[PDB]
């Protein structure tokens, strides 16, 4: 199910505009594109920063893996970490008008594989990682998002960062 009343923005409460995001390509090895936020979201003096991992796909059957550190995995570094949507990867965020709202990924990209588990654990951000595999044919350009936000975590005088995943799928196979 989706929460039709949910609305957010890419910048969240950081007040940073997109031109000031730190933007990165996903880590890509063969047909596996990975966004590992474990280190990039840890508290730093300058924080909160926005850390945007761009998963740009123009090839078929790409597997995508996102890694959001769990609260408490390290003593104080992820105290207040939040992920969005809570039901990822079954639910994603897509831009409607100018705001982020929930969408069923299976409806958004027909044929997408969402395995129930990941390394025998639930394919949910509460187990620290989510995975899905894109199909061999995408007819229309599609952009969806995941949020892994540690910007409300304070350690020392340091503050965590807001992580954004943007999956930009170009048409292919047609």
């Amino acid at each position: 199910k989706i929460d039709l009343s949910y609305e957010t923005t890419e910048s969240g409460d950081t007040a940073v505009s997109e031109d000031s995001y730190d933007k990165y390509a996903s880590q890509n090895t063969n047909k596996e594109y990975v966004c590992d936020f474990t280190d990039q979201l840890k508290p730093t003096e300058s924080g909160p920063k926005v850390k945007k991992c761009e998963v740009k796909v123009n090839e078929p059957l790409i597997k995508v893996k996102i890694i959001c550190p769990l609260k408490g995995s390290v003593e104080k570094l992820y105290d207040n970490i939040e992920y969005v949507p809570k039901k990822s990867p079954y639910v994603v965020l897509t831009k409607e008008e100018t705001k982020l709202k929930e969408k069923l990924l299976s409806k958004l990209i027909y044929g997408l594989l969402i395995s129930p588990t990941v390394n025998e654990k639930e394919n949910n951000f509460k187990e620290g990682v989510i995975e899905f595999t894109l199909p061999p044919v995408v007819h229309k350009a599609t952009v969806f998002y995941f949020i892994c936000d540690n910007s409300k975590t304070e350690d020392d005088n340091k503050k965590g960062n807001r992580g954004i995943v943007e999956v930009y799928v170009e048409p292919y196979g047609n």
Partner: single-chain antibody
Amino acid sequence: QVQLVQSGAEVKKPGSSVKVSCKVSGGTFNTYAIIWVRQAPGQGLEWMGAIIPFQDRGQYAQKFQGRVTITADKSTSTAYMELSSLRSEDTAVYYCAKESGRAVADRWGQGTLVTVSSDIVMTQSPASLALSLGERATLYCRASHSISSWLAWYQQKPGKAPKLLIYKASTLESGVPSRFSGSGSGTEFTLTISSLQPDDFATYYCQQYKSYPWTFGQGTKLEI
């Protein structure tokens, strides 16, 4: 450093067509809404349409459907707005704007003058104002339906483009001095400046970005 450069002013015979271009630079183009707002001479801001370029599909205001076309060339990072069946009342300064991950249109082009010669309601008071240096000014904004906290305040100097001052409902844009403040939620909101200074005398507008069509208060002028 995001810049929006629009095509030059043009004069068009009634009934013809005009296409205004707008190059976006310094900011991601394909995945952020490019928005088009016009302002007729000595009047208020009017929302025309918007497009997230990768979708290749413009959403337009009912007034213009059948007459406008908002396109976007991803390869040149340029948006185009074409308005047909021109009339004398299409005379106005047309603006392109883009959002930057915060929903509000926070980056604005310089404006393009077009001359033709041969839904939520936002209510803003005071309609005009005049206050001395140092005094406090309190503007108001009403909405027919609740816009939650998605309300923005702009400052338009003469011959310039609207400048964002506050977004969400109290969040200050970067570089805006701390004398500005915003409060409110639902249908009633307020803007408040603490110490009027020389640069503060301009026209002010509120704007709901809860839902398309975005709509603007008729404006509150501030005079010396």
